[PDB]
Amino acid sequence: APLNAARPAEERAALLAWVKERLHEEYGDQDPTPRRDPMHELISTILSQRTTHADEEAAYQELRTLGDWDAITLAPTDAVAHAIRRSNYPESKAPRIQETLRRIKAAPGGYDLDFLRDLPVKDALKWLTDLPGVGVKTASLVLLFNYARPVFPVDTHVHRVSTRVGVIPRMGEQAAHRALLALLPPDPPYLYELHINFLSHGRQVCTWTRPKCGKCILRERCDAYALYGDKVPSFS
Template structure:
């Protein structure tokens, strides 16, 4: 399996390049951005985060705001009432446990402790925790979003319909630490542009030779095409 993953990474980098991680992200910014990204697209997430920061210039101002005020600021991102409550509770819990609205310590803490701290916050699952540590701290963790999960299932890297926990655990073991960021970005690109939920463009996929799903679909298509002459013969016989 590790040899397969090595080939997958090489083909992705040949097709999409090697994206570089920005080193100027704040962990708390990244956490709130990722909460806002839930059940919406990147554009609406970015608009919601920009409006939130414009309305509340400090995290303390946001912590003291009412959920109604927060919801009004982030409405463009969708699920504003749910996310406003979640954000306020997260900020309160961080301040209660650390004495400050600052998560920079996560970049220095042992990896499992950092993951455990984030996962203990309300509404923070394995993907959100991994996003904070990868994007803001450059830690060797691998977030699994819906695009990556779909591609990984079709490639046979994880079982279909497995839990989020298992998907993160299994892919986290398979992706080499130095490739976590590039593989994450490139698999998302592939999932959005080529390996779509419906009508995937297998003919344009740089990983088609490794894809169990593409092989299954190709075999099924071949079976259907081979049945065409027989179906036509039966139809002619019935016509007479």
């Protein structure tokens, strides 16, 4: 009885489809994601590095007391750094923020990302990942949620559950974006549902340490449980 992670890609694709339907039954349309507008998501992402969620939100709102995006680009960089002093390493984040705001404005439209809607997906991804402090996960999240493009964001919860089950073998988070999207239909609502139900599952059941496999609807087809039973180790 071979592990899932060794099976042909067409079999691991069918497995991920079975996972998708079981997780939909458990969580329906619960949505734990912040669901921000694009500009807010990008800047929050930059602020979030090595920073708690509470610290991130406070730093963002404090940033916005400096004014609209125009004033923030024009503000002295020391003034920005002081505004975001609740987040970690404010001095290094202050200019990544201004850089990104400057590049956004220069693009067609104002402080808007609506031009991305009409670009080829690969090009749209690249434009976003080129932005300072923006990774492939946030780039994918913005494109899927805000502009309904067929890309699939892989956060720590999606990575952990899909690797434990054995949909993919062990690999880095960025490579897992390529690998998991290759197993999925180009269907944005389908991708969104799968993303958020993974989030709910990783938070409530398939946790970082001591997962609750006895309460898990995926148990009978999970590689990690087959290997370790009740003693699945912590994910890394």
